[PDB]
Write a protein that binds this ligand. Structure first.
Ligand SMILES: Cc1c(Cl)cccc1NC(=O)[C@@H]1CCCO1
Length: 211
């Protein structure tokens, strides 16, 4: 096992094959411990989950400081934090996976390159190299800074995202809100008038598939 695994891929190779909460260490630094939920079953496992929507119990209409730091219950609905995502994606070449489920139907998207810039970039999104079944709805958002109501699409749709003008993905939107563009949307799967019941965003090294 590695003593200070830097992501859920190094924790899974540590023989931890049950999804749930693990400690990772940013940059393998014992002083940068972070509790994360690891999805160890989807497409080979080793995924840090960074967004989960499933029941509408948690409020996602939160401010810049909340989105930078993270909020929620890792075992239920949560957001891992932009500072965490920047530091993790800086450690190597990461891939994004999005899992969606709604009324028993499932879809997914993978982006072979995923990064989040630091605060001086307003946490700029990079997403490239699409595959999957959900439809490439993150392409619209590529290269955009993050937006909250206090730093306006976040205000107009009462959510937070790498908004443009405004969204094809709104996974931090209002739970169960089927009004146009208000809900948990993935446009090229279920459009703008269908809020998706279950959504996860997660990341792991792009080279995991053959390491
Ligand atoms: C990342 C995160 C999750 Cl996922 C769950 C609850 C809170 C946070 N954020 C923090 O623990 C830090 C601690 C000081 C301010 O935020």
């Amino acid at each position: 096992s590695m003593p200070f695994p830097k992501d859920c891929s190094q924790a899974m190779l540590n023989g931890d094959t049950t999804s749930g909460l693990y400690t990772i260490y940013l940059n393998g630094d014992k002083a940068q411990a972070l509790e994360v939920f690891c999805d160890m079953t989807s497409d080979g496992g080793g995924w840090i989950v960074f967004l989960r929507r499933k029941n509408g119990r948690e409020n996602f209409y939160q401010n810049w400081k909340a989105y930078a730091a993270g909020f929620g219950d890792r075992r239920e609905e949560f957001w891992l934090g932009l500072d965490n995502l920047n530091k993790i994606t800086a450690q190597g070449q990461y891939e994004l996976r999005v899992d969606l489920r709604d009324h028993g139907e499932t879809a997914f998207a993978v982006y072979d390159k995923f990064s989040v810039g630091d605060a001086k970039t307003r946490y700029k999104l990079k997403v490239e190299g699409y595959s999957g079944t959900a439809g490439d709805s993150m392409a619209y958002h590529n290269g955009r800074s993050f937006s909250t109501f206090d730093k306006n699409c976040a205000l107009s749709y009462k959510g937070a995202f790498w908004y443009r003008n405004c969204h094809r993905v709104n996974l931090m939107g209002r739970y169960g809100d089927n009004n146009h563009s208000q809900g948990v949307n993935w446009f090229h799967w279920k459009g703008h008038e269908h809020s998706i019941q279950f959504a996860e965003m997660k990341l792991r090294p792009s080279n995991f598939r053959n390491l």
